[PDB]
Swiss-Prot record, chains A, B:
Protein role: Catalyzes viral DNA integration into the host chromosome, by performing a series of DNA cutting and joining reactions.
Gene: pol
Top-level taxon in the UniProt lineage: Viruses
DNA-binding region: 3-55
Protein name as catalogued: Integrase
Organism of origin: Maedi visna virus (strain KV1772)
Span of the signal peptide: none
Quaternary data: Homotetramer; further associates as a homohexadecamer.
Length: 57, 57
């Protein structure tokens, strides 16, 4: 059930480096929530800036 | 189990008007996720800026 992903943030629309992997804490409609361990804050990430790690085959 | 709340955001530390009511979409450690009705955007709200609405007696 636990999902992991890579994610990135945006600075004035410019995409940042891929960060993670980190646990997908919540999955919404078009976005997820992750815990950014640098700032220790929850971040809302749009799905276009998420790379979901495929579950084990 | 559906939880609703009032929430507020701050402008340079000053708390604004209470907004909502709106559904508590996710509960984390010290913060929640809501969807802003006006902007259709997910927001992370620190618990001290949340008023959870109790169910009827
Ligand atoms: Cl946070």
């Amino acid at each position: 059930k636990i999902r992991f992903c890579y994610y990135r943030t945006r600075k004035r629309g410019h995409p940042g480096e891929w960060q993670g992997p980190t646990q997908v804490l919540w999955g919404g409609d078009g976005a997820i929530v992750v815990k950014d361990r640098g700032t220790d804050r929850y971040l809302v990430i749009a799905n276009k800036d998420v790379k979901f790690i495929p579950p084990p085959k």
